[PDB]
Amino acid sequence: QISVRGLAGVENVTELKKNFNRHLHFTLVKDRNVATPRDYYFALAHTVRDHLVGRWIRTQQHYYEKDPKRIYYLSLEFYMGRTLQNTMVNLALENACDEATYQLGLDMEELEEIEEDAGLGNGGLGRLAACFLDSMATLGLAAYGYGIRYEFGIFNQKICGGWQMEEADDWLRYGNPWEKARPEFTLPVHFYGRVEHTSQGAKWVDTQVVLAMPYDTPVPGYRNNVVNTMRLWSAKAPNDFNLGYIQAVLDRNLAENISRVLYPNDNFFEGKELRLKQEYFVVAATLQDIIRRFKSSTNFDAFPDKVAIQLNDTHPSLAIPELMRVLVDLERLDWDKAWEVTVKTCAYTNHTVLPEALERWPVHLLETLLPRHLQIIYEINQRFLNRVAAAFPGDVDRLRRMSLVEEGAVKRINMAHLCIAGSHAVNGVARIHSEILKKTIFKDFYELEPHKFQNKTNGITPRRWLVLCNPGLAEIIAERIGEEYISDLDQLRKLLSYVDDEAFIRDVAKVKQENKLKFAAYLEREYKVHINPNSLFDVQVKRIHEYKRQLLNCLHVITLYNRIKKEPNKFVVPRTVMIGGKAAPGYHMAKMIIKLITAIGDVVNHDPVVGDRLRVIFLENYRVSLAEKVIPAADLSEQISTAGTEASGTGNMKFMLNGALTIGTMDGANVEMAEEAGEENFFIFGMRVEDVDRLDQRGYNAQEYYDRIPELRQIIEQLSSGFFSPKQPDLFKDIVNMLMHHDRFKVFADYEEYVKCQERVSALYKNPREWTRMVIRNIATSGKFSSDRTIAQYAREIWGVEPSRQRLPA
Amino acid sequence: QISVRGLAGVENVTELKKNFNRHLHFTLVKDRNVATPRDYYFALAHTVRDHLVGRWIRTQQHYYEKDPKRIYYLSLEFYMGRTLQNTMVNLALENACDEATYQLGLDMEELEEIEEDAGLGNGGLGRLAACFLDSMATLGLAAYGYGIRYEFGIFNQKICGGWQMEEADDWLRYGNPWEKARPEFTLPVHFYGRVEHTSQGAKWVDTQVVLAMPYDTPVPGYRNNVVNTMRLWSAKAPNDFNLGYIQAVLDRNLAENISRVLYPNDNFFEGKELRLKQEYFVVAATLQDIIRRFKSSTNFDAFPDKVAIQLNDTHPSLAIPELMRVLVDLERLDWDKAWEVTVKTCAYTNHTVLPEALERWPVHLLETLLPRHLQIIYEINQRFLNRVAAAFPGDVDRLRRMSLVEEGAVKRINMAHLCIAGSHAVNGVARIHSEILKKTIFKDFYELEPHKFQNKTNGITPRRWLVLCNPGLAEIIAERIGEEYISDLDQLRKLLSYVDDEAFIRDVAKVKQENKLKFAAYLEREYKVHINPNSLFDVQVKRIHEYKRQLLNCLHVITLYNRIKKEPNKFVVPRTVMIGGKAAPGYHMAKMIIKLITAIGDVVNHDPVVGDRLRVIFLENYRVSLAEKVIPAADLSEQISTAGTEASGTGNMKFMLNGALTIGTMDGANVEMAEEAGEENFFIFGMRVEDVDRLDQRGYNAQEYYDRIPELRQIIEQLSSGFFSPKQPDLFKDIVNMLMHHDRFKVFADYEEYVKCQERVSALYKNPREWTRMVIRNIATSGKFSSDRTIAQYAREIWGVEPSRQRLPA
Ligand SMILES: N[C@@H]1[C@@H](O)[C@H](O)[C@@H](CO)O[C@H]1c1nc(-c2ccc3ccccc3c2)n[nH]1
Ligand SMILES: N[C@@H]1[C@@H](O)[C@H](O)[C@@H](CO)O[C@H]1c1nc(-c2ccc3ccccc3c2)n[nH]1
Ligand SMILES: *Cc1c(COP(=O)(O)O)cnc(C)c1O
Ligand SMILES: *Cc1c(COP(=O)(O)O)cnc(C)c1O
């Protein structure tokens, strides 16, 4: 039916149906009378996977014969979401499968909804990994994502009594048609042991062995017949393992626990052993695989011309000492040559400046678990500190601050320092974030090695984040400017000359309305809740965190509520305020915030005076596949972190792409978004970075805001006295308390400017034509935030590789 | 090439090749340049599985429409072995796959060897279950095998320093192309809880829930297009399970341990909780499945006309109280009606009379774990004991002996008594065994209910145990009498009129010789050991156990050795003595026996005076697929258990079928084998049942044999003094000791008659023509021991079902 969904040729359709019935009989062992929709999803999934196969074999083939430089993207997280629609989109099968399934009288859209999210990440970081893979494939790069195949992904979020409950995300229960187990490339990983010295050199002995078994997942490029690989390792016990008898066999669990579960903390370090085992496991098995693949081209000098290893934060920072261990202890290169090889191979992306997110591992942990790596780390440190001493003679304090070893009650290794020492490039993830790295957190490193520091502002793939989740907007755009923008997002600027085209204005607004209608129904059906879809859709979707300031949003919500109650008969632009996100299981305050939100919902949604002027909806189980539904439906995107705390953000970009206006602070990539659209086209409010710092110097006193702002004071009194929790009047005492005495994120500082800015949004919503011209100005300048731009920048400025857009043959 | 292997039609062959390349590309994602033999095995396995599918769907279909009475074979063990060749044989594909693979230049026989044994059993009992399935399918019965899909089967056996080491049998490591996961028919199983009483009735509450997820395996009939199902349950935790966070997820192991590992004790009870959980798990999930299938035909009166449940020993005896629980507590039938339903549904096969193999569960165990079932058991007991009292008034002692509850320091439930009480038929497994049940172990039950007691002598399937493992013998038989014998084994009597046919004599002997050559090479290649293949092949293959008397065999071996040393220049028929079998991991004495055997091998195989007159080979890792190789190669079958201890045996039958003569005691099915062949055609020696009993009454004194038999005394002295263990001279003190003071199995009683009988075997081996006429007389009368005979007897005399041989359509 729509043209960006490709051709539905009579041969293709006939062929898809034929194969759909083949898989149902042969793969699924079902006939047409007993098949459930789950079965139909499956037969469709095997039919689409069939189209990937020749392309996958041919791509892996071509890399063997061309032997280009290979990129290894190492991450503990890959937040994939569903695979079926993405695969159709990338192979131009969407319309033909739609047609094929229709003629068997099945509805594709209904089948698509049965597929489980692969939720192997927490939020922005794992999801960036996913976008990056799609972009690497679309840009023809010989790139491999490497991670852990967790048996349980991010937990499923239930609400009970307005509280978060956690359930295990058992995503493999029904099988994963997308992965291919490769038990033939199983590799040993070593743990514990001790180090002996020979005349030969150091030797790591008496280790426990855990096996790493890889699972391969196809990553198709956008219509280029390139299919790359994501390889994910699983832990398996060896068979002599432990080997009274029964118990030995049952104790094989203790080794396979390494890959059992994703750690669910977003932007927060927890120094547990099982986590460090996860990090060593993925690093050890990957390096052997990388090395094996290099030996099928004695000579390690060429290694950096054949291999780039990108580290996704510090989570795989052990790649650096592991690479040293292999080169020094097993390959017998001298120290300096090995070190040159390592530094030229490795690059580090930093994703955060929150000090509680920075990985600092206790020494006693690394000493029991990885005792050779601890030796290598010390040796790295000593040599690094000798370079600091020679460049800054006498600056003793520099030496202490720059050490990889933190002194203190418990000695720690600062993994970020290890990454900077052992990488040729260190990048941040938006311009302002990269500037903060050079000015504060890594100022010392930057003075030593200015040439290492770079910026690579994040992007999102427009395949999933536009073509796939928003076919109607994709189509009306293609109707005006063609299809070429989908792999060249800068082309969206051509849309500026349509900003006064009456028919374009109408089409952008109609697509938004259709998405609102579709999402409003999805609310009704799956969670029995009624929204007015003429209202403005105010959405804040992201992990629950104090720095992200869902609490600021709550204050605005409660204010609107209080204003309606004071003057009940006054006009007010209707809103639906939707806030969604998971809280880490032990982050008590994030759990209270979820509770505050739903408690506000209970008061607000049941007030008859309110009518349908204000609704507050907490969106349960926020995940990739729910982002695909709500983001196209949003009018207002809330990006309201304290200036200097959100490294980049990427939800922000998703919404700019999809026809929402942004109310945000000058934080993270919001700064670049505003500069691409024009500050007039954005709702900028609040402290700048500079303002937060001025506040830190004289001291943040929240009391001052509470005395000066009567509307703020009423809200605190309401929170305090049990307005929102009449059965437990003191339920929110921890929230009030934090806000008044211990708020690291200056929620009151920004309140007054936020409410004013929220009034300007309502004023523009009153004028549909102008709301939409501004929407057009946003969508039109969202080109920069394509992850294709970001990856082409990594490729040229870090990896030394040319992207191409040229199709491999079919 | 050979005619029992079916047709190799030009269309078939072309089609198999086409599909073989299809699966290699599409299923396996490999091309021809990177494929390993494991890959080729796999593509061949998916190609053959494709031929099963339409037949499987059509069979399950036909049972729904015909609605015949359904048989449920409940066993904790199913010893399957490999599936590929069996499937080809049964679908008449063997020659065409052979041809198809040859033209791709691959050797089928080499691919077949990559398949793992499904070793989900310990020995005779699990293997009988497997033969029974093949026979049920071949006889057209609507039959389902139900068990547990263990992640680890019987351990792999390594020898180190002549000792058994155990390794985990990780048979699913590479996937199982034969099973189809059916996560849609997942069923709850309940554990722990407590019982409340309502006005409604008893109610089992506050239980832990474990999920049972079924895996289906096709069981093809012999060329009849019937394909039955073996359904095996896997344990899965529920998702709210336990649900700080990480630990909850990791603790899902404690529920899934239920299906993790097969208990490895053959013919020995170990009362561990995990085992009782295994037994309840398979019973609970199966009964729900049975019941669900019955409700798609209010009325439970018809239930016994629609369902037979056969219990494989007492291992699923909880079926009986579970069936009561469902009917009484959930379906709300009164007690008596429920009881009538249960007794008419259930039948019990006993497989052993060894008192240490009998399941007696501690009460405190059933009370914590299954507290309602314990109530039901008591109620069953009380009512049963009231029937005993009314039939035998005043016989107080009868009441105590017949109780389901054993009094004692620890109260126990005698599960065998529960089975007899709650079944309409109780059968033993050979005639002499069934007679011992009625005369000793269950004399009291038999006086109460004579009509319940039956015999059903075991059989083996001739598809695996002749056509498949011994194509050459199958073929020379088909050359004379046709192919029809393969599903009608009695037809082998026609072979008696060929007992003086010179060409037949030559062919039987040539096939034996070829098998010896083939097996002798397999020894050379896989385990670097040299056998003379002109020697007589004396094999004893079975689990290692004191009652099976591998020790008797050792004594014979050592005697032959001593005789050669006394008169080194005298002629002696050369032998290769091969003994193989696993020992249960904690059965110390069985572990010492393995050690004695290999220690005898070290002395005997290195004596230059011996030459190649005597070799002693311990065959490592005895399993189904090694039985398929050694049994066709055997000349002499050793079946030498003390009279009254081996319930039936089935190895005995395998060898009669395959051209070995038998030296055995009048135990188990040896008695029927001898009577079918004629006692002249068998090497019968030793105490009868009656003789063992005479010995028990005056007392077994092993000293008396040691004083009277000088050849026996020399052997004990050699064992004692370190002849066989010169570095640890006292290594065998436990063996000598047991033999002298604590031998429950009267090894010395039988020694003297055994050695004499072994001399008669050597005398006949000297005359090839007469050895072979006698072999012919055995193979010719082995018809009775077909498991088709056994199953047709179960079907008519217990299940009330007519077998048919009529093909379903193709
Ligand atoms: N918060 C940043 C976000 O601004 C940025 O857009 C995105 C991609 O660059 O990454 C986000 C981010 N996630 C994490 C993170 C995620 C999981 C962790 C697990 C353990 C220890 C630290 C951890 C740190 N950092 N930055
Ligand atoms: N020993 C008998 C054998 O003579 C007979 O041929 C075969 C089939 O009927 O079954 C053998 C048998 N196995 C067992 C057995 C096997 C596994 C067990 C696990 C736990 C407790 C008892 C157990 C008892 N009994 N009889
Ligand atoms: C894009 C995305 C994120 C990151 O969102 P931010 O607003 O940058 O925190 C987190 N989760 C999901 C499911 C996403 O799609
Ligand atoms: C037939 C068979 C058995 C049973 O053998 P017995 O001699 O009756 O103890 C045990 N194991 C395997 C592998 C078999 O094939």
CA–CA dist B685, A115 (Å, integer)? 68
- Do residues A253 and A151 make contact, with C-beta atoms less than 8 angstroms apart? no
Closest CA to B223 of B314, B94, B325, B388: B94
Residue found by looking up tokens 């193989």 in the block: B580
Total structural domains in chain A? 2
CA–CA dist B510, B507 (Å, integer)? 5
Q: Does the C-beta of A559 come closer than 6 Å to ligand 1?
A: no
CA–CA dist B263, B76 (Å, integer)? 10
B356 touches A at CB < 8 Å:
no
Write out the catalytic residue numbers of A: 351, 542-543, 548, 650, 654
Closest CA to A147 of A274, A350, A34, A289: A289
Distance of CA A546 to the CA centre of its chain: 18
Q: Does the C-beta of A426 come closer than 6 Å to ligand 3?
A: no
Closest CA to B661 of B474, B508, B445: B508
- Do residues A166 and A594 make contact, with C-beta atoms less than 8 angstroms apart? no
Identity of the residue in B38, B180, B183 whose CB atom sits nearest the CB atom of A184: B38
- Do residues B475 and B3 make contact, with C-beta atoms less than 8 angstroms apart? yes
Closest CA to B464 of B73, B88, B27, B10: B88
Closest CA to A579 of A520, A620, A525: A620
Q: What is the per-residue burial (b if ≥16 Cβ within 10 Å, else e) of A405-437?
A: bbeeeeebbbbbbbbbbbbbbbbbbbbbbbebb
Under an 8 A CB cutoff, do B585 and A236 touch? no
Ligand having the closest approach to the CA of B648: 2
A562 touches B at CB < 8 Å:
no
B245 touches A at CB < 8 Å:
yes
According to DSSP, the β-strands at B163-167 and B156-160 are: antiparallel
Count CB atoms within 10 A of the CB of residue A64.
13
Long-range contacts of A557-560 (CB under 8 A, 24+ apart): A557/A600, A557/A604, A557/A614, A557/A616, A558/A600, A558/A715, A558/A718, A559/A711, A559/A715, A559/A755, A560/A614
B503 touches A at CB < 8 Å:
no
3-state secondary structure B219-248: EECCCCCCEEEEEEEEEECCCCCCCCHHHH
Closest CA to B787 of B644, B654, B604: B654
CA angle A723, A725, A727 (to 5 degrees): 115
Closest CA to A182 of A137, A228, A233: A233
- Do residues B306 and B294 make contact, with C-beta atoms less than 8 angstroms apart? yes
Q: Which of B456, B654, B773, B777 is catalytic?
A: B654
- Do residues B536 and B573 make contact, with C-beta atoms less than 8 angstroms apart? yes
Q: Is residue A517 domain-shared with residue A379, that is, in the same domain?
A: no
CA–CA dist A782, A658 (Å, integer)? 10
For A635-701, the DSSP string reads SEEEE-PPTTT-S--SHHHHHHHTT-EEEE-S-TTHHHHHHHH-GGGSEE-S--HHHHHHHHHH---
A687 touches B at CB < 8 Å:
no
- Do residues B337 and B631 make contact, with C-beta atoms less than 8 angstroms apart? no
User: Would you state the structure tokens that stand for residue A503, as one six-digit string?
Assistant: 């028919």
Give Cβ neighbours of residue B342 (< 8 Å, ≥ 6 apart).
B320, B323, B324, B327, B422
Residue A483's SS3 state is coil
CA–CA dist B17, A50 (Å, integer)? 19
- Do residues B366 and B559 make contact, with C-beta atoms less than 8 angstroms apart? no
Residue found by looking up tokens 């007159």 in the block: B613
- Do residues A327 and A341 make contact, with C-beta atoms less than 8 angstroms apart? yes
CA angle B804, B805, B810 (to 5 degrees): 115
- Do residues A662 and A637 make contact, with C-beta atoms less than 8 angstroms apart? yes
Identity of the residue in A181, A244, A246 whose CB atom sits nearest the CB atom of B261: A246
User: Would you state the structure tokens that stand for residue A476, as one six-digit string?
Assistant: 């009306």
Closest CA to A459 of A229, A682, A665, A652: A652
Under an 8 A CB cutoff, do A61 and B167 touch? no
User: Would you state the structure tokens that stand for residue A291, as one six-digit string?
Assistant: 């090395």
Identity of the residue in A170, A184, A216 whose CB atom sits nearest the CB atom of B36: A184
- Do residues B647 and B429 make contact, with C-beta atoms less than 8 angstroms apart? yes
User: Would you state the structure tokens that stand for residue B62, as one six-digit string?
Assistant: 């036909």
Closest CA to A27 of A38, A14, A43, A41: A43
Ligand having the closest approach to the CA of B622: 4
CA–CA dist B600, B557 (Å, integer)? 8
A297 is in an annotated binding site: yes
Q: What sign for the dihedral angle of Cα A629, A635, A641, A645?
A: positive
CA–CA dist B327, A114 (Å, integer)? 37
Identity of the residue in A56, A216, A249 whose CB atom sits nearest the CB atom of B260: A249
Residue B62's SS3 state is helix
Give backbone dihedrals phi and psi of B641, rounded to 5 degrees, phi first: -65, 150
CA–CA dist B134, B84 (Å, integer)? 14
Domain that holds residue A264: 1-459+787-810
CA angle B54, B59, B61 (to 5 degrees): 95
CA–CA dist A746, A701 (Å, integer)? 9
List CB contacts (< 8 A) between B248 and chain A: 168
Q: What is the per-residue burial (b if ≥16 Cβ within 10 Å, else e) of A658-678?
A: bbbbbbbbbbbbbbbbbebbe
Residue B639's SS3 state is strand
- Do residues B80 and B130 make contact, with C-beta atoms less than 8 angstroms apart? yes
| Ligand 2 centroid to residue B267 C-alpha, Å | 5
Residue type, B571: F
CA–CA dist B87, B220 (Å, integer)? 7
Give Cβ neighbours of residue A311 (< 8 Å, ≥ 6 apart).
A74, A317, A319, A346, A347, A348, A349, A419, A423
Give Cβ neighbours of residue B83 (< 8 Å, ≥ 6 apart).
B115, B118, B178, B217
CA–CA dist B107, B15 (Å, integer)? 18
Q: Is residue B50 domain-shared with residue B129, that is, in the same domain?
A: yes
Count CB atoms within 10 A of the CB of residue B675.
14
Bridge partner residues of A639 (DSSP): A664
B408: left (phi over 0), alpha (psi -120 to 50) or beta: left
Give Cβ neighbours of residue A784 (< 8 Å, ≥ 6 apart).
A457, A459, A489, A490, A672, A676
| Ligand 4 centroid to residue B660 C-alpha, Å | 15
CA angle A51, A54, A57 (to 5 degrees): 135
According to DSSP, the β-strands at B346-349 and B425-428 are: parallel
Closest CA to B234 of B266, B254, B258, B252: B258
Q: How long a stretch of residues is chain B?
A: 810
Between the alpha carbon of residue B469 and those of residues A69, A725, B462, B624, B625, the distances in Å are: 53, 77, 10, 11, 9
- Do residues A428 and A436 make contact, with C-beta atoms less than 8 angstroms apart? yes
Closest CA to B29 of A218, A289, A83, A285: A218
Q: Is residue B663 domain-shared with residue B807, that is, in the same domain?
A: no
Closest CA to B34 of A80, A60, A639: A60
According to DSSP, the β-strands at B536-541 and B575-580 are: parallel
What is the Cβ-side half-sphere exposure of residue A426, based on CA atoms within 13 angstroms? Answer: 28
CA–CA dist A271, A284 (Å, integer)? 20
CA–CA dist B416, B351 (Å, integer)? 11
Secondary structure letter of residue A613 according to DSSP: S
By C-alpha distance, the chain A residue nearest B36 is: A184
For A220-239, the DSSP string reads E-SSS--EEEEEEEEEE--T
Q: Is residue A370 domain-shared with residue A495, that is, in the same domain?
A: no
Helical H segments across B587-688, by residue range: 588-604, 624-633, 651-657, 670-677
Bridge partner residues of A180 (DSSP): A216
Q: Is residue A754 domain-shared with residue A791, that is, in the same domain?
A: no
CA–CA dist A209, A187 (Å, integer)? 10
Bridge partner residues of B549 (DSSP): none
Q: What is the resolution of this structure in A?
A: 2.5
Give the gap in angstroms from C-alpha A274 to the nearest C-alpha of chain B.
10
Residue type, B21: N
Residue A770 is inside which H or E element, if any? helix A768-780
- Do residues A421 and A384 make contact, with C-beta atoms less than 8 angstroms apart? yes
User: Would you state the structure tokens that stand for residue A23, as one six-digit string?
Assistant: 């898989």
Between the alpha carbon of residue A241 and those of residues A209, A213, B156, B804, the distances in Å are: 9, 16, 13, 49
CA–CA dist A132, A460 (Å, integer)? 8
Q: How long a stretch of residues is chain A?
A: 810
Q: Is residue B416 domain-shared with residue B478, that is, in the same domain?
A: no
Residue B191's SS3 state is strand
Q: Tell me the residues of chain B between 48 and 67 that have a Cβ less than 8 Å away from chain A.
A: 50, 53-54, 56-57, 61
Residue A727's SS3 state is coil
User: Would you state the structure tokens that stand for residue A414, as one six-digit string?
Assistant: 């600062």
CA–CA dist A591, A585 (Å, integer)? 8
Residue A475 is inside which H or E element, if any? helix A471-481
CA–CA dist B749, B423 (Å, integer)? 39
Closest CA to B718 of B596, B607, B616, B627: B596
CATH code at position B657: 3.40.50.2000
Residue type, A640: I
Q: What sign for the dihedral angle of Cα B490, B496, B501, B502?
A: positive
Under an 8 A CB cutoff, do B239 and A168 touch? yes
B186 given a catalytic annotation: no
Ligand 2 atom nearest residue B275's Cα: 20
According to DSSP, the β-strands at A636-639 and A614-619 are: unpaired
Rounded-to-5 percentages of helix, strand, coil across chain A? 55, 15, 30
Under an 8 A CB cutoff, do B26 and A250 touch? no
- Do residues B314 and B348 make contact, with C-beta atoms less than 8 angstroms apart? yes
Q: Is residue B418 domain-shared with residue B504, that is, in the same domain?
A: no
Between the alpha carbon of residue A74 and those of residues A71, A125, A291, B156, the distances in Å are: 10, 12, 15, 37
CA–CA dist A312, A314 (Å, integer)? 7
Q: Is residue B587 domain-shared with residue B687, that is, in the same domain?
A: yes
Give the gap in angstroms from C-alpha A600 to the nearest C-alpha of chain B.
27
According to DSSP, the β-strands at A143-148 and A70-74 are: parallel
CA–CA dist A646, A430 (Å, integer)? 10
Q: Is residue B190 domain-shared with residue B122, that is, in the same domain?
A: yes
A24 touches B at CB < 8 Å:
no
- Cβ < 6 Å from ligand 2: which residues? B 122, 124-125, 128, 265-267, 269, 351-352, 357, 359, 429, 458, 646-650, 668
Q: Is residue B241 domain-shared with residue B312, that is, in the same domain?
A: yes
Count CB atoms within 10 A of the CB of residue B379.
15
Which of B180, B245, B270, B273 is most worth mutating to test chain A (most A CB atoms within 10 A of its CB)?
B245
User: Would you state the structure tokens that stand for residue A566, as one six-digit string?
Assistant: 């004071």
B390 touches A at CB < 8 Å:
no
- Do residues A66 and A136 make contact, with C-beta atoms less than 8 angstroms apart? no
Give Cβ neighbours of residue B746 (< 8 Å, ≥ 6 apart).
B642, B687, B692, B695, B700
Q: Is residue B420 domain-shared with residue B481, that is, in the same domain?
A: no
Count CB atoms within 10 A of the CB of residue B358.
17
Interface size, chain A vs chain B, as Cβ–Cβ contacts under 8 Å:
103
Bridge partner residues of A453 (DSSP): A426
What is the Cβ-side half-sphere exposure of residue B796, based on CA atoms within 13 angstroms? Answer: 11
User: Would you state the structure tokens that stand for residue B185, as one six-digit string?
Assistant: 């028919």
Q: What sign for the dihedral angle of Cα B522, B526, B531, B532?
A: positive
Give Cβ neighbours of residue B316 (< 8 Å, ≥ 6 apart).
B74, B75, B76, B279, B282, B283, B286
Greatest distance between any 2 Cα atoms in chain B? 90
Q: Is residue B496 domain-shared with residue B410, that is, in the same domain?
A: no
